[PDB]
Amino acid sequence: LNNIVSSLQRNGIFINSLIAALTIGGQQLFSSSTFSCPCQVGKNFYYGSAFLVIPALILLVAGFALRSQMWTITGEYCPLECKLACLRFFSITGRAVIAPLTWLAVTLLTGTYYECAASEFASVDHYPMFDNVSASKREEILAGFPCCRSAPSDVILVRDEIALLHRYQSQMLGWILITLATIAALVSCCVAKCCSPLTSLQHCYWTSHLQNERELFEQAAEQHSRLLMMHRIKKLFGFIPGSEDVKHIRIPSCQDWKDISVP
Amino acid sequence: LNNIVSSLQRNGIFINSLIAALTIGGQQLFSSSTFSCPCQVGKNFYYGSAFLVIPALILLVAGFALRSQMWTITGEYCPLECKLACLRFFSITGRAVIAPLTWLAVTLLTGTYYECAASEFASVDHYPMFDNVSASKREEILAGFPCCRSAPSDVILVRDEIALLHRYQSQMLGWILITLATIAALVSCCVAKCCSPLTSLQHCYWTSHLQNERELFEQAAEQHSRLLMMHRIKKLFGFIPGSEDVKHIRIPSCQDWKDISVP
Amino acid sequence: LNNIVSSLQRNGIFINSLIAALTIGGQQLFSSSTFSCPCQVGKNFYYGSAFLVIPALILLVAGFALRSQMWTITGEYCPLECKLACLRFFSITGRAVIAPLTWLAVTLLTGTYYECAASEFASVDHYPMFDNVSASKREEILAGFPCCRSAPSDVILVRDEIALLHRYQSQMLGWILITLATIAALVSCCVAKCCSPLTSLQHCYWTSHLQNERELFEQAAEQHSRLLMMHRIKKLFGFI
Amino acid sequence: KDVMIFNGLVALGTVGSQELFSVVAFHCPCSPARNYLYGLAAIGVPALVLFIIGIILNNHTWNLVAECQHRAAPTFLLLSSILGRAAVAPVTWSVISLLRGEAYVCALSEFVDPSSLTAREEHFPSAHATEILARFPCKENPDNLSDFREEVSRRLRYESQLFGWLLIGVVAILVFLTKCLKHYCSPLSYRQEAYWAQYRANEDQLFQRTAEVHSRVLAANNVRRFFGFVALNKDDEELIANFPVEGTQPRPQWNAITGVYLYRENQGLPLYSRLHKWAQGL
Amino acid sequence: ELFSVVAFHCPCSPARNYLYGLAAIGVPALVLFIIGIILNNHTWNLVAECQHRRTKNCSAAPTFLLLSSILGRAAVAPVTWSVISLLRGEAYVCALSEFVDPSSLTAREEHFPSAHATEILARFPCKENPDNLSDFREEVSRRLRYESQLFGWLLIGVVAILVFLTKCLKHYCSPLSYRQEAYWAQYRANEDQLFQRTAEVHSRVLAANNVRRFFGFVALNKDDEELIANFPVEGTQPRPQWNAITGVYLYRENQGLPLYSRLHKWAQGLAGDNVEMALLPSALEVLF
Amino acid sequence: SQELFSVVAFHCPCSPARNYLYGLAAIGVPALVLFIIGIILNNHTWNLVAECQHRRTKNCSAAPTFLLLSSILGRAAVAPVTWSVISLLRGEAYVCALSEFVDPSSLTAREEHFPSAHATEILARFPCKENPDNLSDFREEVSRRLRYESQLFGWLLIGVVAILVFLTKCLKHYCSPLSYRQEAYWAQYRANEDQLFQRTAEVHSRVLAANNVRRFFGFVALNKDDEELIANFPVEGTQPRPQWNAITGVYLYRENQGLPLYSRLHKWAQGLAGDNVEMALLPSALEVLF
Amino acid sequence: ELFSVVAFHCPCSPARNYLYGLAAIGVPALVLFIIGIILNNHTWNLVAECQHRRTKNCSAAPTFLLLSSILGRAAVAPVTWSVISLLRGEAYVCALSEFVDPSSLTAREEHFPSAHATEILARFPCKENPDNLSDFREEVSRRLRYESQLFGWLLIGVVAILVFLTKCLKHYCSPLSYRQEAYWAQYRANEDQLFQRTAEVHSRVLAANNVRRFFGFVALNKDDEELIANFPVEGTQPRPQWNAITGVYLYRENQGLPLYSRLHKWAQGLAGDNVEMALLPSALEVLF
Ligand SMILES: CCCCCCCCCCCC(=O)OC[C@H](COP(=O)(O)OCC[N+](C)(C)C)OC(=O)CCCCCCCCCCC
Numbered sequence A, B: 001l002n003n004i005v006s007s008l009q010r011n012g013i014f015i016n017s018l019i020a021a022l023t024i025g026g027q028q029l030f031s032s033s034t035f036s037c038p039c040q041v042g043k044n045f046y047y048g049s050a051f052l053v054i055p056a057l058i059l060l061v062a063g064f065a066l067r068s069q070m071w072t073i074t075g076e077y078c079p080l081e082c083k084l085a086c087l088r089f090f091s092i093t094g095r096a097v098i099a100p101l102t103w104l105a106v107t108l109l110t111g112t113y114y115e116c117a118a119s120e121f122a123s124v125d126h127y128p129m130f131d132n133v134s135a136s137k138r139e140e141i142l143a144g145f146p147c148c149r150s151a152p153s154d155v156i157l158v159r160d161e162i163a164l165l166h167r168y169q170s171q172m173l174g175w176i177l178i179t180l181a182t183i184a185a186l187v188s189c190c191v192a193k194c195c196s197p198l199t200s201l202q203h204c205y206w207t208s209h210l211q212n213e214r215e216l217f218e219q220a221a222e223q224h225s226r227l228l229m230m231h232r233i234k235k236l237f238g239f240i241p242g243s244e245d246v247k248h249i250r251i252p253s254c255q256d257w258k259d260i261s262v263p
Numbered sequence C: 001l002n003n004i005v006s007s008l009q010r011n012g013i014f015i016n017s018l019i020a021a022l023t024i025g026g027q028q029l030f031s032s033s034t035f036s037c038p039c040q041v042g043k044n045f046y047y048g049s050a051f052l053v054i055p056a057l058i059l060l061v062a063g064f065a066l067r068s069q070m071w072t073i074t075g076e077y078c079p080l081e082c083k084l085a086c087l088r089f090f091s092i093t094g095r096a097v098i099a100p101l102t103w104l105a106v107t108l109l110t111g112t113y114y115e116c117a118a119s120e121f122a123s124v125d126h127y128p129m130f131d132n133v134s135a136s137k138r139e140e141i142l143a144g145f146p147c148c149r150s151a152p153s154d155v156i157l158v159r160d161e162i163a164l165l166h167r168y169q170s171q172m173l174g175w176i177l178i179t180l181a182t183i184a185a186l187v188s189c190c191v192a193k194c195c196s197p198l199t200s201l202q203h204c205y206w207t208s209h210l211q212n213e214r215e216l217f218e219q220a221a222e223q224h225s226r227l228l229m230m231h232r233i234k235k236l237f238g239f240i
Numbered sequence D: 001k002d003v004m005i006f007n008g009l010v011a012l013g014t015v016g017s018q019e020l021f022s023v024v025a026f027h028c029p030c031s032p033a034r035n036y037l038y039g040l041a042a043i044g045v046p047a048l049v050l051f052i053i054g055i056i057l058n059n060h061t062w063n064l065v066a067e068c069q070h071r072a073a074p075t076f077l078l079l080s081s082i083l084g085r086a087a088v089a090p091v092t093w094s095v096i097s098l099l100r101g102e103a104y105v106c107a108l109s110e111f112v113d114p115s116s117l118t119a120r121e122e123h124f125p126s127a128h129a130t131e132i133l134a135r136f137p138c139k140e141n142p143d144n145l146s147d148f149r150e151e152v153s154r155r156l157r158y159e160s161q162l163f164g165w166l167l168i169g170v171v172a173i174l175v176f177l178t179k180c181l182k183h184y185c186s187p188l189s190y191r192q193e194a195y196w197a198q199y200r201a202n203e204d205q206l207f208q209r210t211a212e213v214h215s216r217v218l219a220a221n222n223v224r225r226f227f228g229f230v231a232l233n234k235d236d237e238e239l240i241a242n243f244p245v246e247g248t249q250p251r252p253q254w255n256a257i258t259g260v261y262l263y264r265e266n267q268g269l270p271l272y273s274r275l276h277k278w279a280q281g282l
Numbered sequence E, G: 001e002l003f004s005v006v007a008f009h010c011p012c013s014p015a016r017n018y019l020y021g022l023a024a025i026g027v028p029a030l031v032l033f034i035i036g037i038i039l040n041n042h043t044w045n046l047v048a049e050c051q052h053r054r055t056k057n058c059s060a061a062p063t064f065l066l067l068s069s070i071l072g073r074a075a076v077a078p079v080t081w082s083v084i085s086l087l088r089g090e091a092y093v094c095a096l097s098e099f100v101d102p103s104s105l106t107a108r109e110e111h112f113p114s115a116h117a118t119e120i121l122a123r124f125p126c127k128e129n130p131d132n133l134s135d136f137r138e139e140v141s142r143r144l145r146y147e148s149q150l151f152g153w154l155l156i157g158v159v160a161i162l163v164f165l166t167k168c169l170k171h172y173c174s175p176l177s178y179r180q181e182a183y184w185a186q187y188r189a190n191e192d193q194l195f196q197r198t199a200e201v202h203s204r205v206l207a208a209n210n211v212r213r214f215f216g217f218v219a220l221n222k223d224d225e226e227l228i229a230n231f232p233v234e235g236t237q238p239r240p241q242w243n244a245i246t247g248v249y250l251y252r253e254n255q256g257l258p259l260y261s262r263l264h265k266w267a268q269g270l271a272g273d274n275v276e277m278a279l280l281p282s283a284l285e286v287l288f
Numbered sequence F: 001s002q003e004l005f006s007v008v009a010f011h012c013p014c015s016p017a018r019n020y021l022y023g024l025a026a027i028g029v030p031a032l033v034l035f036i037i038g039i040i041l042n043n044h045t046w047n048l049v050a051e052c053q054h055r056r057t058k059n060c061s062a063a064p065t066f067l068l069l070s071s072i073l074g075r076a077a078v079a080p081v082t083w084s085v086i087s088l089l090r091g092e093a094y095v096c097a098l099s100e101f102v103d104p105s106s107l108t109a110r111e112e113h114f115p116s117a118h119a120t121e122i123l124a125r126f127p128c129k130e131n132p133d134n135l136s137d138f139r140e141e142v143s144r145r146l147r148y149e150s151q152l153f154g155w156l157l158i159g160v161v162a163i164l165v166f167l168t169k170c171l172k173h174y175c176s177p178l179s180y181r182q183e184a185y186w187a188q189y190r191a192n193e194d195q196l197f198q199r200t201a202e203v204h205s206r207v208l209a210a211n212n213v214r215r216f217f218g219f220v221a222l223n224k225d226d227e228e229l230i231a232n233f234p235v236e237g238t239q240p241r242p243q244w245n246a247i248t249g250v251y252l253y254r255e256n257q258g259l260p261l262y263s264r265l266h267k268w269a270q271g272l273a274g275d276n277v278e279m280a281l282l283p284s285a286l287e288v289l290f
């Protein structure tokens, strides 16, 4: 069963599904805990805009920076080589961006961020009751009603309508984004199937070679380091580490301790 | 028991059933959670049309995309080889298209999406109460009643009738779609049994051979990568990785690290 | 399963993730335990400033004190050898300062710590009711309402906008600080990949030799002493 | 036997789906010329889909198509076999729907004769006669008409279940007649026919198992030819070690083992399949 | 489950309910009668006997006992269904409700309306009766349900006597003792179990050779390899050889030693130019 | 079986001259069925018929036959009696059957409030509670008088049976010429013979059936234990019909040379039980030639 | 639910509930008395002793002791039932309810009616009593339940003395010693256990020999094959050999050494022309 789990982990689909589920759970928890939807007459679009965009950027940067392949590509950058580097960087791009896109889609489907962000940009020319010739009380009431100011004074029905409109609009935006995202993915794959010098068989072989070579290199490096130090300690204390030392003991002097202090 | 499960996964019927069940459950949860049937008088058909059609296309594109053999088929397309490629694409088409039709059928049979979609397209000539010489309040009430505005003012009966009518139509579409798909499926499979050059038994063996050579080629490529990498270590450090390397220690110089930097 | 856990422990991503989780869990208990938003008219910013900075920097001292690599760095520091110390400091630094930024972000996004800290710095110019030309009662009530004083005197509208304005400014600061920390982590990560004489693979080899070298010497040092006592007892009473 | 295991699951599953379908998705569009079509589409359409589906999953139909593309008694067996395994699903759905009675009263409520009711004088308007009757199944009619509604809602329910039992009686007779015709018109005795059916099941079980094994061995050999080595487990490494590679069968030979069987015997000794005909022929 | 769907529902309509009772009872009795015929192998070798003779050679006496045994072994299922449906009483009170005479009704004064006698009587099973008539609703129900159960016990009694008279007549008129027929019965059960079980093994071994001739090897499990090793097949049994063991058999005795089956009749050698349904024409015609 | 027990539940038809016909049928039919089952499953009635089969001439007199039916009917009547007793002790079958014959004038526990116009009709409806509340006391007075008689006959029937069993087993031992210890050894022999004979009949049929199946396919698929039976217990032929006919039938302790014989199979094995060809497959060998 | 069937149900009617109480208690005691005699083996050899003699040769002196043992041992079950039925008190309050004298009633003023004293009293056990007489009912119930339990306890007292007096006289009057009769009892319980065991083995081996003569072999279990190998039978014991071990035996001694049973007496040879119940007539009559 553990081997089956590891095989599923090898496949990316389960990993992206788990990442999306974690992002959904985090969005629901954050919305339940700390939204509070303030009415700040002056600065309220910025609150929702930050809560919508910034978490997406943190997810993007965390996803891209956490992969050492992007570091290796940047180090190589800092022909065939350019194409393989571009393909290698693009390979993990989908897993990098799957989290912020899920975040954005869930937030737009919920619509509360869009409601507390785009309320001050609502239209009042259609409503004669929202004339407010003073040109001042209109914006304060516009910013203050969506938050907690019910004020059942023959206004709530009107405000209810606007909320619905935004909600409807919110949904559309989310839907549109998803569609575009999908299209982008397809065209990206098209590039991966048009600009790739590798044939239908060379890509998987190359990726397996890179992964296998990194794994065997790290294991061999660890083994060689351990072996070099068994020899260093054998010279040092007169006996091999991990062996029986009933034969000889060095009994080192004080000056010897500084010798192994070079590294 | 696990072998029996692995046998069942080989069967396509159990997989198609699991996919259908997951789609039905997801549709139920999505409809119960994030539908809300908006009452936008101006644009209410757009919401229902999107919720009815767009997820089907997203599931369809996913069903095509996550299948690895699609990219190979497109690359070959980008005689008998053409027939084989077309037959492989037809074979994957069944799993690609099983899910969106299940989504469409379930949504149409439930009826709520269709009720909230084509409400404003209803006819009022049957009911003399919806006179509305002004030609404005009629669309308002028509798009308002279906979602949440019961308004028990001796109009609900008419609203009820309208709902039933729409529901009935919705049901028909679903069944018609089912029927249509079924007939298509039939003739589609018939084509696969007429245009294909291989016999009934030759096709199953040929598909099994394809899967076996693909898996064995991938494993052999990974193993060859491992043999090459290990050869590079025995050349560089002078020992075989993962073996008793107590014999000799190379201690390579600074320049030797740049040698393994080529790939 | 235990081997899998040990392999995960070998990875610092789980250590940072767990440390942040316990800091958040400890913070939520502690914020509701003995915080109370103390109502000091005179000097209440000190309580807020203390709770905002001191608990975070204490874990910095804990992180430095709990790691012995810095001890070798300071001993040698009190060329290639100096350059390697900087990389060793850089790696320890990332795990050293991860906890306070988690604490700083959580408290400041909570909002209650900064409302009870910079309440006295709020401006009453927007509010015509808080004229108070005597300049004495204005600061008394300003430090009074946010702590526990509801004060149903048709002035509560003042405290929500003060709270909401404080809450909004609090969120922007942490998200900017988180972004600034991420950029700082990126550029320092870039400096460590450029000024380091080691390659992308040689650095892993050198670190692997270091970690393998401490354990092998330490276990051999343990064997060397035990073996010497065994003769000492043989010379002492005559048995082995 | 194994047939009852497959038929029992299909028969039970259709009833479960029908019960689920009726409680979650079934609403009579109570209005003339609408519920009749809805009720008819609630029986025939689900049955037709199962009938087409049952054909597609059957392996023997595609074998029949291939033989006809390359082109009595052999056709009698398959049609008695494919329908016996594919027409089960529509029939069970059809009978449960009729026995339940929801769909039929949903359909024929429009055509109820207002003057055919009893227990009171006929009370129906000249213009809204069908409109009132069509609304009976929805149970939305006023309680003043519940005296008349119960008679109609139970008369058509009687007609639904009566048709459900007569369909079972017709089907049961046909299955008996098919069994008699299959045995009586067959050229071989039923003891040999039972042996013939056992051989076909055994051949396909071994043929499928060998073909999968042969493909893996053939694929493994190609890996050795292409790479010079194979990474196989103990069982796979044994399989090639015990199974030498026969090679590629000629195109006619695969065509020789496909098609329909007429039970042609070669000088006394019977041959029960095309593969047995090919193996004994050469 | 199924019982919810097949639950009895009495249509309270005169001259209409007993038709439903006939369909709700007579159809399951017919289906269980058909299933008993199909499952009984003794009805197929009877057909096989008629298949080969094609001239009605056999007399009525061998057929009459053979046909009787098929029906008797299959009529049990309808009877145990007809009895239960009669002891329940639902299927009979519904059928005979409208035939109850209001003149003979008692347990209440004569308040029975005469405007619609049959219509009201037929509505008793559904409890759609006026409360002024409720005393008769339980009076009519108990009278009919009594006759339903009275017929059920008489059906059990008559069946329990026909079974006794059949078994008594079977032993008395048989030419064999009841112990030899007991041994004969223990032989046929043992032969059928062994014959079918080797027919499965013989097919598998024969199928393996055909698979081996095609792929060059066969993928057998641990136990299947034993079947191939232990039981090697040399050929196939001719159709006339199969036809010599199919049909009906009535205790033919050879040289004072009993024979217990057609296979036993064939094994002793007492059962075994023109070629039919041949794959290929005459060998001379093959040349031409 | 909750559903199947309600099928045989006793539902009294509260109607006059009608509730005893149901009571007779609901009790007399299960008693008759249990009587028939006892006869069918008893092997001692089939060798009695088999005795009448081959003798065909009324050879057995009244003395042996009447001592065989008494054994058959005595062993069979156990089941109807133990059902006719439980029904009487329950009391439901008797109060239903006799509720219409209770004398209205003999009623008590109240003044003479019992109607006389329709007296049989009201009385018959007592078991179903369908009685006016002014006669509730009369209903329970009858419900106890009739239930008493039902259980009074239920205990007398047990007492009478327990005496007939005592008298039968006492006269059986007194009149039998054998000692009770030899009849106990004889009963142990008949149990061991009738068990081994069936056990060998199954084996001798399976081994014979295995030979015929082997003659057809060339091999027989046999289990681990079945393969031992073929080697351990080989068969060579079938026992003739007259040999089977010499072990089936009644038997009453015939003794030979001062040594008892305990069964027809035992009597046959000693050789004391052993031209015209009947029901042959084919005509005479002389007719086969033509 | 056998217990619920035999549950006591008092018919509250004068001159009628003691007939039921007599039957509901006296019949179960009678049945247990008959079962006790039937199961005892000391009565069948008593019948056997009266069977072979045919002339009442044995005197009343030994016959009386054997009958006393049979009746005394069999009467345990009726007594332990007639005691329980008395300690419960239900069976006696029902029987004696009508015979309570109203004049002797107390715990209430003399309001007890004299119209139908027996009829009202007889309904007391069934709780169907007016609430104005419930004081008398609970007074009568405690009076008649006491007499039941008083009679029940005195019956145990009498039995516990008869058992003591029987055993003391059984030891004082017997010529043997109690340590020898204990050895004798341990022998009779071992002869019977072995004799019944060897009878089953001897019958099975004899039954196997006859079956082998029929089929040519016997299908024996793993353990039954040991019986045939270890214990071969050669014939059947003659009828006079079986008659010599059945009957009543009372401790005869031979040459100073005791004999404990007539099988032991027969084994020593101290027990053992006209042919009876022969299969076939004299060998001279067979020839003709
Ligand atoms: C789940 C079941 C529970 C038990 C309920 C029934 C128990 C029956 C057990 C014995 C069955 C059996 O084998 O019956 C045997 C006989 C067959 O007679 P034959 O043709 O001479 O066969 C010869 C003997 N054989 C069978 C050995 C070859 O049956 C009968 O004579 C008829 C069966 C009674 C049902 C039909 C009666 C007529 C219809 C009604 C008319 C009013």
Ligand SMILES: CCCCCCCCCCCC(=O)OC[C@H](COP(=O)(O)OCC[N+](C)(C)C)OC(=O)CCCCCCCCCCC
Residues within 6 Å of the ligand: F070, F071, F072, F073, F074, F075, F077, F078, F079, F081, F082, F160, F161, F164, F165, F168, F169, F172
């Ligand atoms: C399910 C059972 C639960 C327990 C209740 C029954 C007790 C069973 C054990 C004891 C019975 C027994 O063993 O019966 C066996 C004897 C048979 O004696 P026979 O006629 O000489 O037969 C030959 C002797 N054999 C059988 C030993 C070889 O029966 C009887 O003598 C009487 C049977 C009682 C029923 C008939 C009573 C009269 C009818 C009613 C009149 C009003």
Ligand SMILES: CCCCCCCCCCCC(=O)OC[C@H](COP(=O)(O)OCC[N+](C)(C)C)OC(=O)CCCCCCCCCCC
Residues within 6 Å of the ligand: G065, G068, G069, G070, G072, G073, G075, G076, G079, G080, G158, G159, G162, G163, G166, G167, G170
């Ligand atoms: C479930 C059971 C509960 C367990 C306890 C029961 C008691 C067991 C021990 C006592 C029985 C016993 O020992 O009986 C033995 C003697 C029999 O006398 P004998 O001829 O000398 O027999 C010699 C002893 N033998 C049999 C071992 C050879 O009995 C009696 O004389 C008294 C029996 C008591 C009941 C009958 C008393 C008279 C009837 C009532 C008058 C109102």
